[PDB]
Amino acid sequence: MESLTLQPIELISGEVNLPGSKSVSNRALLLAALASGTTRLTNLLDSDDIRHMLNALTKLGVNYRLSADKTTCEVEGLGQAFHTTQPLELFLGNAGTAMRPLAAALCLGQGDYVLTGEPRMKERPIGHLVDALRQAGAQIEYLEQENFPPLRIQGTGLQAGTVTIDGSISSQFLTAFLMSAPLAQGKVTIKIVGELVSKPYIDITLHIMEQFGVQVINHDYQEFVIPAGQSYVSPGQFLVEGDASSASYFLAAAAIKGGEVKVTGIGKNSIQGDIQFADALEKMGAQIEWGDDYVIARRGELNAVDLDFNHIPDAAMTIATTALFAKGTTAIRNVYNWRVKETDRLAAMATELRKVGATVEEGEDFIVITPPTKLIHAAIDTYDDHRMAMCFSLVALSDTPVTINDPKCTSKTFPDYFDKFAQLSR
Numbered sequence: 001m002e003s004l005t006l007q008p009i010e011l012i013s014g015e016v017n018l019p020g021s022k023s024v025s026n027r028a029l030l031l032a033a034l035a036s037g038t039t040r041l042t043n044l045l046d047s048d049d050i051r052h053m054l055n056a057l058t059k060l061g062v063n064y065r066l067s068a069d070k071t072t073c074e075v076e077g078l079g080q081a082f083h084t085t086q087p088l089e090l091f092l093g094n095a096g097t098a099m100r101p102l103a104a105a106l107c108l109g110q111g112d113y114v115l116t117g118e119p120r121m122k123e124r125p126i127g128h129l130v131d132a133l134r135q136a137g138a139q140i141e142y143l144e145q146e147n148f149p150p151l152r153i154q155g156t157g158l159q160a161g162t163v164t165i166d167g168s169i170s171s172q173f174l175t176a177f178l179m180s181a182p183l184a185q186g187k188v189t190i191k192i193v194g195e196l197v198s199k200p201y202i203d204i205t206l207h208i209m210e211q212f213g214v215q216v217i218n219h220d221y222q223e224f225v226i227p228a229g230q231s232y233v234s235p236g237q238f239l240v241e242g243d244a245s246s247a248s249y250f251l252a253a254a255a256i257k258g259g260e261v262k263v264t265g266i267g268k269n270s271i272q273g274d275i276q277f278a279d280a281l282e283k284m285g286a287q288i289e290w291g292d293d294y295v296i297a298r299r300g301e302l303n304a305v306d307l308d309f310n311h312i313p314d315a316a317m318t319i320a321t322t323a324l325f326a327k328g329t330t331a332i333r334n335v336y337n338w339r340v341k342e343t344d345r346l347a348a349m350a351t352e353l354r355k356v357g358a359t360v361e362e363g364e365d366f367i368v369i370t371p372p373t374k375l376i377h378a379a380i381d382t383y384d385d386h387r388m389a390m391c392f393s394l395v396a397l398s399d400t401p402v403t404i405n406d407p408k409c410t411s412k413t414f415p416d417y418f419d420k421f422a423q424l425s426r
């Protein structure tokens with residue numbers, strides 16, 4: 001076990017050039033592999049989740065070149081589904097954006113695969129996706145527990161026709177099926193049976209699919225039609241947006257202890273839903289300036305809010321620790337799927353927030369946070385969850401230190417987090 005103790009930080013100010021978006025990166029890499037032509041990606045994220053995708057693509061026979069700095073990557077598209085001739089084991093860490101999309105895509109071609117990862121990934125649901133894939137003819141075996149990885153998949157092709165996807169636990173099941181659908185044997189219709197959470201991530205998927213030359217008919221997020229005969233064609237150059245979830249910590253830091261912070265790589269017209277974290281901060285009293293390729297947060301005040309955060313579940317965690325600095329009791333609602341992510345985040349957040357002095361109601365799908373007058377120095381457990389480390393770093397914006405256990409867990413999406421935070425810490 002390792003730990004990092006951050007002494008109290010008296011002022012936050014500066015600028016951060018954001019790491020690339022994890023969500024965008026993994027979608028673009030998979031579509032680049034399937035597409036015709038070479039995709040020239042820039043601002044790609046270097047993090048564990050991307051590394052696992054890259055490693056899978058290597059095993060799957062994709063030729064690519066990654067720059068020394070790991071942000072520039074040229075991917076030679078296969079122009080078809082994967083075709084492999086020896087059984088492969090794909091270790092996918094705890095990367096949902098690799099596991100879910102690859103579970104679908106590997107059904108399209110020819111080969112034999114075991115999709116696995118870290119212990120926690122074996123405890124994250126995938127049954128809703130498998131059920132839909134099987135409707136379209138897939139051959140998928142649960143190797144351990146029913147409805148969970150690890151999976152054994154044999155390539156079969158996916159049939160034309162109508163399938164049903166439950167959207168209530170993860171949007172990633174729909175994302176995964178959408179991405180594979182153009183390579184099915186004909187027109188695909190996806191009917192949603194179990195209302196959709198994390199809706200903005202579907203918007204990301206559709207947007208990037210269009211960049212790669214594929215049209216999808218979205219009938220009010222309840223039915224999606226993917227017309228027949230389409231193929232992915234590389235857009236050529238592809239710029240990955242900066243990560244809006246990663247930005248949340250620095251915008252919040254300014255809201256708490258600024259000063260002002262400018263983050264670059266996201267702006268008013270970015271596709272990522274998590275830019276909407278800035279709208280929530282603004283409701284708390286931060287001053288927000290929107291640019292085209294930047295967002296600025298400036299200290300104003302911090303008042304508690306009571307909002308539905310289903311649209312921004314990842315950045316919503318940042319509100320939980322920001323709430324420690326707000327006037328009044330904050331409620332973060334409609335975030336059930338916190339429970340099925342890197343850890344059970346509702347349980348973890350409740351435990352750790354109480355350790356720094358907050359009083360907390362942990363609801364089934366919500367959390368209510370009453371800040372302490374005086375923050376307590378605690379050794380925060382991070383649960384193999386990058387965001388627990390990043391959210392709790394903000395505690396040091398008080399007059400009190402915070403100790404972060406296993407600080408390297410930030411590597412899932414943001415290996416250089418602490419250095420960027422330090423840059424701002426005056």
Ligand SMILES: O=C(O)C1=C[C@@H](OP(=O)(O)O)[C@@H](O)[C@H](O)C1
Nearest residue numbers: 023097169170171172198201314
């Ligand atoms: O599709 C995506 O890129 C993501 C979807 C979200 O998952 P859910 O749809 O399960 O909320 C989010 O938590 C994850 O970090 C990224």
Ligand SMILES: O=C(O)C[NH2+]CP(=O)(O)O
Nearest residue numbers: 094095096097314341387
């Ligand atoms: O990044 C996050 O906060 C949640 N990730 C879930 P995954 O991307 O592993 O499905």
Ligand SMILES: [Cl-]
Nearest residue numbers: 015016017018
């Ligand atoms: Cl920087």
Ligand SMILES: [Cl-]
Nearest residue numbers: 354358359360
């Ligand atoms: Cl309590």
Ligand SMILES: [Cl-]
Nearest residue numbers: 360361362363
């Ligand atoms: Cl409780």
Ligand SMILES: [Cl-]
Nearest residue numbers: 377378379380
């Ligand atoms: Cl402690």
Ligand SMILES: [Mg+2]
Nearest residue numbers: 122123145148
């Ligand atoms: Mg289990």
Ligand SMILES: [Mg+2]
Nearest residue numbers: 189219223225
């Ligand atoms: Mg109809």
Ligand SMILES: [Mg+2]
Nearest residue numbers: 347351352381
């Ligand atoms: Mg205990």
